[PDB]
Design a protein around this ligand. Structure first.
Ligand code: BCL
Ligand code: BCL
Ligand code: BCL
Ligand code: BCL
Ligand code: BCL
Ligand code: BCL
Ligand code: BCL
Ligand code: BCL
Ligand code: BCL
Ligand code: SF4
Ligand code: SF4
Lengths: 358, 95, 94, 362, 358
């Protein structure tokens, strides 16, 4: 049987704005594919405009989890800006703590995104492009203070491994993507190149030695990768005129999974040409990645998508059909919507499109 | 404002449904006869000096001849506020 | 095709000419915009060959007088290159 | 109670010919109420494949193919037309031309190709101990010379960009595989069992032609398989140049939508039935690449199954060892429905490659 | 419908011992994903202590199968010892026969297992580690007598291929993993490196020429690979004080699958800290590998798990719950246990853990 109870809400804003509120609840009675149970997690994402002249924004992220009687925490906090429309700059710092061990770090990064082609026919014959092949290049300089015995041990072991073996650059990818993540890398459509180390140094600092490393890598995609094909959509620096948030939490166990999500941010709705707007095309990486854990138990589906529009907006060409119009709201439940939900909770990437106008 | 509406002359049939929605303070829509009104001789029109871009004339989805267009602010021309996705078809027989 | 695909008013896909800018060539800027208005196309002899057969119709929107080769009667006989005569619609508000 | 219904209605027919002939007619209908895994919907397509014997002395045959599709309010067309011949039993030669048109853009091309297929071993014990080999590892090598006339501005732009990319970067040869297999296709490449090697460019030239410059490119690549790849393991079966004494056709069409999928297939061609030794013949072993490739989209909705398979034999032929069992014998026809046949159909519509074998004699 | 009838039993031993008896029955009415049917197989695995001073043990293995009217047999018999805790030595011989063809061989092998890191924080903050990345290196010297015409043909063809082509070292991996096995290699989490040939020789022997080959290869894992992450668990040379056995057999057909397994060996239960013991963590490679054939037909599930403990042992924190306690036995059936069984018969790796004490 294994019913799957889920509850969704989108709330939009009028005019030329693109902001939106998102709310989500979920429940299943199926065992998660985690070789360590139970597992709990909360995520806070916040972002505020540092200053619009430079385009600089400040973004924070906090993770706590309890994984089989073990507390894990990861804090990161950074400043990001688009230096060009295909280069991005970031300066940030954070820390990671597991059990009793903990250490901080400060990074200094740049990212460059390149597409394999720029043909304008692809721009005048296809109104809604989806797949777009390209490659990203990351250049990272990170400094970590060495104060613990274990930090010094890791540092010396890494220096010895980098010095001695000639296949460090490609074997590091084995340690990098631990467990099933590596497998997804092939299927999710990505390709990680061999890293290239530009030098590991150690310098005296405030309290003691600090290990400085700078390295470069690249990863390409066939179009399914959102971070490449949709480089412009995922960092809306224009509409961040007020702080935005994303705030989620799951709590897994030996008998089903619990989900809870809030969010409010721009980029929810985009122009679709001819005066009509649309909900943004659903990202594909989460769908195909979750499809690797969603095929283990056949399940029953019930859900309710509830979309609230501003004054004077109408939904036209909603595929599949909605069920009710409470004069501003549209509700989807059962039938073809339920079939589509069951389809996408197993890795399917079929399109459920909503167009609205005024 | 932007996005004018521009009733097409040659396609209009004079049903007048476009004229109903325009607010009474704005008599932007009118009639033209020039002949006998049984073979299509009373086609209507839109006055551009009074229209205030309500979209009541286009968003209502009432024109049956596709005579209202609602040209976009930059250069684009519409004909109806949404069009089906133009598939193509055959016949089947389950054997 | 079937009446239920595309728009039911028209017997085939309709296009309009929207731009007539002169760029070192006179009339490079023929911008064939469809009825739904999601693209901005051009003469593009493939478009011309699908025009001449049965499937494309174009119109001129009285809102490139000679550069589109008006010929000589009824104030309108617009032809594109040699073959097919793009009919035009009128919108005279006066 | 239980889970989703989603019935899947399908209808199949095979019609054979007697004697030593191998020709056959194939007919297929299909329907599902499940959303296709296409991030652009709706999507429609028709396919025409025709082939006629150019001349038997050389072994040359002429083959045509036409594709039309409407993908989310966008018309796409691809025409190809070529002449193929087996120069040896492990080399093949082809000369052809075609065009591709999307929306308003369109361009033609003419290619000049050769293909060489090699197996990794030739041990004859594998030939005397195994009566029906299935997996056979090998590698294919493609050598292509294609010319495309440059007449559009966009064609010239693509050409110049490609020349600049090939000149500048040193990793073009292996990064081209990212652009090559767009989207999920790339992923299938790993699982479907294939391995594409890095291409090797032998020179990009441009020469004046009838109406203007023409870009000429010639390149080589190779791809190997562990045995699951039909184009390698069954190199001899997929191009039956002997029995093409009359024109043959394959003619299909699918029409997808946000609520299920429609299928329609006709065909008539040789190679449907093969000798099985000891006087018995058999339907050819089912290809594996289509099964495993379709298995990547067939696991998204649990479904109910109903189908016919209806096989018509010539005079005096009998089916013996049909596994699973058939249901009826209308004195020349054999019908499969429900039960183990339905289970096998549900099995193969999800990527399974279990064997359903039919042997007939006279 | 496709009911799946399965029957399981574990029997443990008391004290500090780790020995155990395992019994298993299984039945399905689904067509196996074998492009040749029917297919039958029996497996015998025996091991006895050669001598404890050296640590040397002797292990035998016999395989018979009938694959679509074709008899196949493989015999191997070898002596293995742990020379260090990360090196292993083996000397053995065997033969393989298909239909009428048959030939023997004698091998001489060493294996080295290396982990990518040794951080002790990972050892003091995580009580039950699961994923552990590393790499294995195999060095093999095998001799095969050339007496048949076909053996000489294979030998000459291989010498010609190794001499002529420059891409033999990496293209050999195509012939190596025949068919779907290759695909699993990516997904199962493994990476096989290019082999390196150290020389192919031929020398006169008792009855004639013998082909001698020695070669090296390596394979790394992201942690999912048991042969790497659990290098210490899979060869319990301590508790083999009496002969142990594993004895299985499957028998497939065009309409379902039959399974039958006996076994008795140490390593079934391990210490879990704080006086409690546990059943060993379930291996992951078999689960994910069988998940590639277990998604083809939706099926109904019924099973027993019946665990028998020694005197004075109690199960505490069994997740999911058991059903009955016949004063020494614990039985799992239906409900969450059935859901977990259906989960793991499709590739899921959720944890079903049993802790017992006294
Ligand atoms: C995931 C796919 C690609 C990836 C894609 C990107 C993209 C895209 C970007 C970076 C950028 C960065 N990446 Mg990277 N990057 C990857 C793997 C890595 C790895 C690694 C060990 O694997 C490292 C060290 C880095 C390092 C970095 C830094 C150089 C840089 C800034 C990080 C940041 O701000 O932190 C902050 C960390 C987070 C906020 C964690 C939350 C991340 C998730 C994905 C955010 C989800 C957004 C959520 C859906 C909506 C949020 C809205 C809220 C209102 C804010 N990347 C993988 C391979 N990387 C950024 C950059 O350009 O810097 C110049 C950037 O835009
Ligand atoms: C971008 C990744 C974060 C990071 C995130 C984590 C996480 C997450 C964990 C640790 C953990 C630990 N960290 Mg740390 N760690 C980083 C930077 C460092 C540096 C350094 C000189 O920069 C050092 C010495 C360490 C040291 C240590 C290990 C000794 C310790 C436990 C072993 C472990 O798995 O490590 C993991 C090692 C790393 C992820 C990279 C170490 C970098 C090496 C030493 C220097 C760079 C080499 C190479 C050029 C970079 C390759 C790219 C990376 C492979 C992605 N970290 C960077 C800032 N670190 C563990 C812990 O906190 O408690 C057990 C753990 O779970
Ligand atoms: C930076 C990320 C990983 C790391 C990534 C790698 C990679 C990748 C490799 C090694 C390699 C090695 N590493 Mg290291 N290694 C790290 C931390 C460590 C630590 C430690 C106490 O933290 C230790 C003892 C080692 C020890 C070693 C040896 C097992 C081996 C090479 C030793 C040598 O050549 O002589 N590494 C960090 C945590 N290490 C090489 C090896 O042989 O692995 C089998 C190798 O390819
Ligand atoms: C698909 C698996 C392999 C593949 C396997 C083969 C095989 C096998 C052959 C070729 C051959 C050719 N391939 Mg190749 N080839 C592949 C990828 C490519 C790519 C590319 C960009 O990816 C290119 C450019 C080429 C190029 C070419 C030309 C060099 C050559 C002739 C093509 C042809 O006649 O067109 C015509 C195009 C078609 C007819 C389209 C229809 C194709 C489908 C597969 C046909 C299905 C047959 C249907 C089931 C039954 C038809 C029966 C009807 C009665 C006719 N191949 C992939 C990697 N290639 C042929 C050759 O040898 O030339 C010397 C040949 O025999
Ligand atoms: C075997 C593949 C067919 C082909 C099939 C298509 C298809 C399908 C499409 C295009 C499309 C286009 N074609 Mg073309 N195209 C071919 C040959 C060419 C050549 C040339 C010099 O030979 C050029 C300049 C072009 C130019 C163009 C692009 C400018 C344009 C839109 C971008 C796109 O995605 O391109 C795709 C580019 C190619 C598939 C290969 C271009 C070849 C390059 C320029 C020269 C060979 C370089 C290298 C040695 C060969 C690598 C192998 C290929 C990667 C498989 N084509 C060959 C004959 N072409 C698009 C269109 O028609 O409307 C948008 C589109 O959808
Ligand atoms: C032949 C098939 C693809 C193609 C395949 C590749 C591949 C593969 C690569 C490039 C690369 C590049 N290509 Mg190219 N490229 C094509 C068509 C184009 C077009 C165009 C208008 O049609 C443009 C502008 C480009 C432009 C570029 C730059 C983004 C980049 C290298 C520029 C340089 O070194 O300086 N390509 C054709 C359509 N191109 C290189 C790159 O950096 O990609 C990120 C690269 O590796
Ligand atoms: C499977 C994952 C890894 C693998 C992991 C290991 C591991 C781990 C070991 C070896 C070891 C060996 N491997 Mg290796 N090895 C692999 C692939 C290969 C290949 C090949 C062509 O692919 C070859 C030729 C070899 C060759 C060899 C010899 C060098 C050596 C001894 C074999 C043995 O004793 O035979 C005997 C053959 C068997 C007994 C067949 C049964 C095998 C299965 C897996 C046993 C299941 C155990 C069962 C669950 C419980 C048994 C308990 C009973 C009481 C006994 N390996 C794959 C890539 N290999 C051993 C060694 O170290 O030698 C020094 C060793 O410990
Ligand atoms: C570890 C693998 C076992 C082995 C297991 C099998 C199996 C299983 C089969 C055969 C079969 C055959 N064996 Mg043997 N075979 C081995 C060693 C040899 C040697 C040799 C000089 O060592 C030779 C000449 C042969 C010869 C033959 C082929 C002529 C014959 C049928 C073709 C086949 O597929 O072969 C398969 C070839 C091999 C598996 C490897 C052959 C080794 C080559 C010639 C020398 C080593 C080259 C290279 C350095 C090693 C690469 C590693 C391997 C690819 C894994 N074998 C080793 C001992 N052999 C078939 C049979 O018995 O009846 C049809 C069959 O099904
Ligand atoms: C050792 C395991 C396999 C083996 C693995 C390979 C691999 C791997 C390759 C070859 C390659 C070749 N092998 Mg060999 N090859 C074997 C047994 C044979 C036998 C035989 C009667 O047993 C034959 C005829 C061949 C013949 C050949 C040719 C098809 C080809 C190179 C010929 C050359 O360069 O000139 N191999 C054994 C059974 N062989 C090369 C090739 O071209 O493959 C297409 C290649 O890459
Ligand atoms: S847009 Fe408004 S003002 Fe203009 S014609 Fe229509 S209803 Fe009248
Ligand atoms: S609704 Fe259309 S047809 Fe009727 S009067 Fe208005 S413009 Fe003319």
């Amino acid at each position: 049987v294994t019913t799957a109870h889920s509850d969704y809400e989108i709330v939009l804003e009028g005019g030329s704005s693109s902001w939106g509120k998102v709310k989500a609840r979920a429940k299943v009675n199926a065992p998660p594919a985690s070789p360590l149970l139970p597992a709990d997690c909360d995520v806070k994402l916040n972002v505020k405009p540092l200053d619009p002249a430079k385009g600089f924004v400040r973004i924070s992220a906090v993770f706590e989890s309890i994984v089989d009687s073990t507390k894990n925490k990861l804090t990161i906090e950074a400043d990001i800006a688009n230096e060009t429309k295909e280069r991005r700059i970031s300066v940030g710092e954070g820390m990671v703590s597991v059990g009793d061990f903990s250490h901080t770090f400060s990074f200094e990064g740049s990212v460059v995104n390149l597409f394999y082609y720029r043909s304008d026919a692809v721009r005048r014959n296809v109104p809604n492009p989806i797949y777009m092949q390209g490659r990203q290049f990351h250049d990272i300089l990170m400094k970590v203070p060495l104060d613990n015995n274990d930090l010094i041990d890791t540092w010396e072991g890494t220096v010895k491994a980098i010095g001695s073996t000639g296949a460090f650059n490609d074997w590091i990818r084995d340690f990098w993507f631990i467990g099933p993540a590596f497998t997804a890398l092939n299927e999710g459509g990505q390709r990680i190149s061999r890293i290239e180390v530009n030098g590991l140094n150690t310098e005296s600092g405030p309290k003691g030695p600090v290990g400085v490393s700078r390295w470069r890598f690249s990863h390409g995609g066939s179009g399914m990768v959102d971070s490449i094909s949709r480089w412009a959509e995922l960092f809306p620096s224009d509409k961040l005129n007020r702080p935005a948030q994303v705030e989620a939490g799951f709590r897994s166990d030996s008998q089903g999974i619990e989900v809870k999500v809030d969010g409010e941010f721009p980029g929810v709705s985009v122009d679709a040409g001819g005066g009509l707007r649309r909900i943004l095309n659903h990202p594909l990486i989460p769908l195909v990645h979750h499809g690797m854990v969603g095929k283990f138990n056949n399940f029953n589906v019930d859900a309710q998508l509830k979309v609230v529009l501003p004054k004077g907006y109408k939904i036209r060409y909603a595929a599949p059909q909605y069920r009710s119009q409470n004069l501003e709201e549209y509700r989807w439940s059962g039938g073809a919507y339920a079939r589509w939900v069951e389809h996408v909770c197993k890795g399917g990437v079929g399109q459920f499109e909503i167009l609205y106008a005024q | 404002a932007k996005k004018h509406y521009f009733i097409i002359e040659n396609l209009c049939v004079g049903c007048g449904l476009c004229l109903d929605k325009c607010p009474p303070k704005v008599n932007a829509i009118g009639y033209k006869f020039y002949g006998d009104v049984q073979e299509g001789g009373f086609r209507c029109y839109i006055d551009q000096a009074a229209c205030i871009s309500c979209s009541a004339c286009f968003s209502g989805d009432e024109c049956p001849s596709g005579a209202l267009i609602e040209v976009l602010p930059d250069g684009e021309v519409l004909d109806f506020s949404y069009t089906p996705p133009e598939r193509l078809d055959f016949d089947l027989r389950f054997l | 095709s079937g009446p239920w695909s595309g728009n039911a008013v028209h017997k085939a896909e309709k296009y309009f000419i929207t731009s007539a800018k002169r760029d070192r060539d006179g009339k490079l800027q023929i911008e064939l915009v469809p009825a739904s208005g999601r693209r901005k196309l051009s003469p593009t002899p493939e478009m011309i060959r699908r025009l001449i057969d049965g499937e494309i119709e174009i119109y001129i929107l009285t809102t490139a007088i000679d550069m589109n080769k008006e010929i000589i009667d009824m104030e309108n006989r617009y032809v594109i290159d040699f073959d097919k005569r793009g009919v035009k619609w009128t919108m005279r508000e006066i």
